Design a protein around this ligand. Structure first.
Ligand SMILES: *C(=O)/C=C/c1ccc(O)cc1
Length: 124
């Protein structure tokens, strides 16, 4: 899939993408509900993090999969952007739960329709 990380219209291009098309992206992509439960999780993300994309869908990202993100700097921004019903934040972060510490760039952005949220990830 020909989509760049950070692109201005990313929520339109990825809108309603199926799991197979999401696996074609150059960067990691996760879709969460407003509680943080994982709806979609692509192959590029699994290659970065080690998680198995099939097994994590349905788990809670903040409570279960990614406790290192349960902090004001990641989860706090997520829950505030959900609450305003609007979210568009980009920041670097380190993933270090049961893995070699890996620094990434994270982009969280509200998905176009409904009440869903994207978490995009690439290495830095
Ligand atoms: C910290 O616990 C980070 C964990 C993590 C980040 C991103 C993922 O896709 C999976 C786990």
């Amino acid at each position: 899939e020909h989509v760049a990380f950070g692109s201005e219209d990313i929520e339109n291009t990825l809108a309603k993408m199926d799991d197979g098309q999401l696996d074609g992206l150059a960067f990691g992509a996760i879709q969460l509900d407003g509680d943080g439960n994982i709806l979609q999780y692509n192959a590029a993300e699994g290659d970065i993090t080690g998680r198995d994309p099939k097994q994590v869908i349905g788990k809670n990202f903040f409570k279960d999969v990614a406790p290192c993100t349960d902090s004001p700097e990641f989860y706090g921004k997520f829950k505030e952007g959900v609450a305003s019903g609007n979210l568009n934040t980009m920041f670097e972060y380190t993933f270090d739960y049961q893995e070699t510490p890996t620094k990434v760039k994270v982009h969280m952005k509200k998905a176009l329709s409904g009440d869903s949220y994207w978490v995009f990830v690439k290495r830095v």
